[PDB]
Write an enzyme that holds these catalytic residues in place. Structure first.
Site, PDB file in Angstrom:
ATOM      1  N   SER A   1       0.831  -1.216   0.000  1.00  0.00           N
ATOM      2  CA  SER A   1       0.000   0.000   0.000  1.00  0.00           C
ATOM      3  C   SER A   1       0.850   1.244   0.000  1.00  0.00           C
ATOM      4  O   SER A   1       1.731   1.335   0.853  1.00  0.00           O
ATOM      5  CB  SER A   1      -0.804   0.104   1.331  1.00  0.00           C
ATOM      6  OG  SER A   1      -1.695  -0.956   1.487  1.00  0.00           O
ATOM      7  N   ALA A  69      -0.564  -0.346   5.663  1.00  0.00           N
ATOM      8  CA  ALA A  69      -0.229  -1.352   6.674  1.00  0.00           C
ATOM      9  C   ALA A  69       1.017  -0.988   7.469  1.00  0.00           C
ATOM     10  O   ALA A  69       1.995  -0.467   6.916  1.00  0.00           O
ATOM     11  CB  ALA A  69      -0.121  -2.707   5.999  1.00  0.00           C
ATOM     12  N   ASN A 241       4.825   0.905   2.924  1.00  0.00           N
ATOM     13  CA  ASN A 241       4.958  -0.155   3.915  1.00  0.00           C
ATOM     14  C   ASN A 241       6.428  -0.330   4.356  1.00  0.00           C
ATOM     15  O   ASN A 241       6.892  -1.386   4.790  1.00  0.00           O
ATOM     16  CB  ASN A 241       4.407  -1.479   3.466  1.00  0.00           C
ATOM     17  CG  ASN A 241       2.911  -1.611   3.311  1.00  0.00           C
ATOM     18  OD1 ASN A 241       2.113  -0.825   3.837  1.00  0.00           O
ATOM     19  ND2 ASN A 241       2.414  -2.627   2.623  1.00  0.00           N
TER      20      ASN A 241
HETATM   21  O1  LIG Z   1      -0.827  -3.050   2.773  1.00  0.00           O
HETATM   22  C1  LIG Z   1      -1.385  -4.110   3.064  1.00  0.00           C
HETATM   23  O2  LIG Z   1      -0.669  -5.091   2.905  1.00  0.00           O
HETATM   24  C2  LIG Z   1      -2.730  -4.306   3.775  1.00  0.00           C
HETATM   25  C3  LIG Z   1      -3.348  -3.120   4.453  1.00  0.00           C
HETATM   26  C4  LIG Z   1      -3.735  -3.070   5.798  1.00  0.00           C
HETATM   27  C5  LIG Z   1      -4.294  -1.901   6.314  1.00  0.00           C
HETATM   28  C6  LIG Z   1      -4.495  -0.820   5.479  1.00  0.00           C
HETATM   29  O3  LIG Z   1      -5.078   0.396   5.774  1.00  0.00           O
HETATM   30  C7  LIG Z   1      -4.123  -0.870   4.138  1.00  0.00           C
HETATM   31  O4  LIG Z   1      -4.407   0.335   3.518  1.00  0.00           O
HETATM   32  C8  LIG Z   1      -3.564  -2.018   3.637  1.00  0.00           C
END
Ligand SMILES: O=C(O)Cc1ccc(O)c(O)c1
Ligand SMILES: [Ca+2]
Lengths: 557, 206
Positions: A1, A69, A241
């Site tokens: 993300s 995430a 991430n």
């Molecule tokens: O990035 C990922 O792997 C999963 C994920 C979890 C929470 C979030 O808010 C998101 O936007 C994306």
């Protein structure tokens, strides 16, 4: 993300711009649900996964918010001491404590029913037990007991009007998630949210601890410890991430790492390239990053140095010159199935051969198979999520950096051979494999592009639509499952805010019993593929002006 | 009017809810959700609770057992029981608004039942607050915020100790799965702040 947020000093023709691409895979019907809520203190517009009460992506006309995430380490494993006699008990703080238990019956369409028992200790549910050692393993989550409050923190934050009010809600979200903020005056912010344990000294969070008492967490760390920044000196916030901040430890997953090789660098260089950006330029970073090979920047220097003393007719050198001419942007040919330059297929076979000669050779079977993937593996339907840099490749990047890498090379992965000798051998393996399939003329090589599938099964592997409801898009794009952009104080409009998003295949999943498909079942699907977007409306006058239908209900609780 | 819920859909079919109190507002949201995504929501409900094998059979029995072993439902019902009346309204309003459309659907199925219910052979059931909360818990928490591999790490570490000896097997473990890496690119610049805690990286707990 991913997310990028652009503040006052970097923005042009606005004071703040926020672009968000959450990546959860691609489904039919759509992962997220568009919805506007007006009343009871709420005045919001946006979209959110599984139509949760709280909107994960949107704004309320004064502030805007989004997520990615977090991947902090908020789960540890407790090795519980069982007893051969007095089963259902475990040793804790000097006494034999009884387990919680519950019986479950699984009813089965067209089968017999199945019943089993679930066991729980003070540390959490029991994952597995080792009868030989008389150890039961219990999974302990830092957020346990606060699931419901995290959902409500995501709902109440929609009413915040400033940093102060928004962070009050951020301090109650307990899951490991990054949260982002923008406002009407051009302020921008980020908080790595969640509950993280306060561990005893000597607890190495990557491995299990004894559940007998002495290793128990002391509590949870305060919110002042959570990494956060408001109005950064740089003028922008970007994330894919990657790590929140220097020295912050990541999830204990063996396949997950925060290293010198990271895909967020691709975003950074696009935002640092221009002194200020417009909204149209901030949207356009979605198109570039979608199409960027992620290994090129990392291993191109190493490949160049190794082939520098080679002659012009040495095919290992020709492979590197093709890479040196390429900017790394993949583009489809006119056939809609092959890439215009063969760069990603060359890196893929090179890297597979490099890992099998280095990282894989140092790891005992069968753990060696955790470090062999190049990061290009897919099927005919395409990747099920984002493209990233593989774990073997991140470890390999540190090893080719030599004593410029902060990680101590306890085993030499090149096993005594000069780097360049191992890189030339892998390049020979690459030339042999690809030339055999495509021939010796590198310039007519037409290598297979990655496609994109909107699946009928949800992320768990369970049908949420019939199989013919699957949708296919020719070009794989490394981008959010949905994209949304919010622009505050546009100098080009009278409106204080402008916002856009795209929710594909469409707002509705409805199909009548006669097979008639709703009107909004797929009217956003072509818009997704072309990098287009629809307007998000907030005010009554904009909603009334674009209204297609109205329904009024009269209900009393 | 306190009892009025107004629903305006735009040119893309996106619903806007106008209502005067909490329960009315979330009842409207649940009602348009049941209109737009009823089969998706019902398979999401069975996925997060481990009741897929009831409608889909034997191939999903291990899945259902895994979902059930990974949570404790009574602990979630206790959290719902402690909410203030305003907060509980959010969840209860949303389940009630869904129920209102499900009631109409189960009364006029020739025209309103989503085709897939016929295809898969079963019909929607009514929702309670517990089910709305489990949509969020089963996706976001129980899956996207539940990641660990500590037991597999231990087995890796043990195999590295056999290969290279006790001290050396630990140092290779730190090469492969370091705790932190000071050159990782960070969302927050070092001039603004750095994480203050330092951790043990020796497995000192054995
Ligand atoms: O990035 C990922 O792997 C999963 C994920 C979890 C929470 C979030 O808010 C998101 O936007 C994306
Ligand atoms: Ca851990």
């Amino acid at each position: 993300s991913n997310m990028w947020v652009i503040g006052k000093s970097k923005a042009q023709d606005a004071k703040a711009i926020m672009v968000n691409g959450p990546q959860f895979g691609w489904y039919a019907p759509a992962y997220t649900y568009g919805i506007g809520l007006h009343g009871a203190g709420y005045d919001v517009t946006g979209n959110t996964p599984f139509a949760y009460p709280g909107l994960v992506f949107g704004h309320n006309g004064v502030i805007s918010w989004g997520s990615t995430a977090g991947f902090g380490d908020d789960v540890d494993i407790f090795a519980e001491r069982l007893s051969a006699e007095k089963p259902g008990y475990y040793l804790h703080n000097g006494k034999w404590v009884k387990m919680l238990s519950r019986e479950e019956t699984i009813t089965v369409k067209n089968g017999q029913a199945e019943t089993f028992t679930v066991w729980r200790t003070v540390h959490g549910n029991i994952l597995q037990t080792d009868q030989t050692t008389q150890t039961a393993y219990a999974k302990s989550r830092a957020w346990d007991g606060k699931e419901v409050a995290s959902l409500l923190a995501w709902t109440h934050q929609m009413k915040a009007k400033n940093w102060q009010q928004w962070t009050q809600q951020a301090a109650k979200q307990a899951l490991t998630i990054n949260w982002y903020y923008a406002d009407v005056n051009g302020n921008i912010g980020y908080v790595h949210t969640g509950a993280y344990p306060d561990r005893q000294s000597g607890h190495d969070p990557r491995l299990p601890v004894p559940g007998t008492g002495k290793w128990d967490w002391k509590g949870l760390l305060p919110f002042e410890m959570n990494p956060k920044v408001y109005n950064p000196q740089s003028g922008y916030i970007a994330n894919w991430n990657n790590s929140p901040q220097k020295d912050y430890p990541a999830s204990d997953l063996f396949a997950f790492l925060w290293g010198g090789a990271d895909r967020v660098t691709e975003i950074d260089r696009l935002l640092e390239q221009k002194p200020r950006l417009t909204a149209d330029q901030a949207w356009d970073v979605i198109r570039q990053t979608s199409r960027q090979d992620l290994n090129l920047r990392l291993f191109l220097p190493t490949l160049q140095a190794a082939t520098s003393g080679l002659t012009q007719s040495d095919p290992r050198r020709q492979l590197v010159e093709t890479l040196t001419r390429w900017d790394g942007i993949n583009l489809l040919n006119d056939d809609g199935k092959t890439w215009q330059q063969p760069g990603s297929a060359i890196l893929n076979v090179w890297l597979t051969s490099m890992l099998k000669r280095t990282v894989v050779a140092a790891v005992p079977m069968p753990f060696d198979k955790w470090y062999s993937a190049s990061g290009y593996e897919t099927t005919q339907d395409g990747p099920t999520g984002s493209l990233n840099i593989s774990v073997g490749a991140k470890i390999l990047y540190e090893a080719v950096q030599g004593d410029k890498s902060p990680i101590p090379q306890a085993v030499d992965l090149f096993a005594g051979k000069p780097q360049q000798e191992v890189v030339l051998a892998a390049l020979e393996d690459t030339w042999e494999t690809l030339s055999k399939r495509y021939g010796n003329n590198v310039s007519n090589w037409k290598t297979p592009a990655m496609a994109l599938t909107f699946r009928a099964n949800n992320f768990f592997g369970v049908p949420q639509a019939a199989a013919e409801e699957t949708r296919h898009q020719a070009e794989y794009q490394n981008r959010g499952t949905e994209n949304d952009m919010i622009v505050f104080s546009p100098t080009t409009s009278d409106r204080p805010v402008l916002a856009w998003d795209v929710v594909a295949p469409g707002q509705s999943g409805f199909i009548a019993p006669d097979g008639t498909v709703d009107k909004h079942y797929e009217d956003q699907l072509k818009m997704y593929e072309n990098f287009g977007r629809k307007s998000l409306w907030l005010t009554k006058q904009d909603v009334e002006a674009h209204k297609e239908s109205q329904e009024v209900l009269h209900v009393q609780r | 009017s306190s009892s009025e819920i107004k629903i305006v859909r735009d040119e893309y079919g996106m619903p806007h809810i106008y209502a005067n109190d909490t329960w009315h507002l979330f009842y409207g949201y649940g009602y348009v959700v049941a209109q737009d995504r009823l089969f998706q929501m019902e398979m999401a409900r069975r996925s997060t609770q481990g009741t897929v094998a009831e409608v889909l059979g034997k191939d999903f029995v291990k899945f259902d057992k895994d979902i059930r072993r990974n949570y404790w439902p009574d602990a979630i019902r206790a959290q719902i029981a402690a909410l203030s009346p305003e907060d509980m309204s959010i969840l209860q309003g949303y389940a009630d608004g869904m129920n209102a459309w499900i009631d109409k659907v189960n009364t006029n199925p020739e025209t309103l039942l989503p085709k897939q219910f016929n295809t898969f052979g079963f019909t929607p059931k009514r929702w309670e607050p517990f089910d709305v909360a489990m949509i969020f818990v089963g996706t976001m928490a129980n899956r996207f915020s539940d990641s660990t591999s500590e037991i597999d790490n231990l087995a890796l570490l043990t195999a590295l100790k056999d290969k290279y000896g006790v001290s050396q097997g630990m140092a290779v473990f730190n090469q492969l799965k370091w705790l932190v890496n000071p050159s990782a690119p960070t969302t927050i610049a070092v001039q603004e702040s750095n994480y203050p805690l330092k951790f043990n990286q020796q497995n000192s707990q054995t």
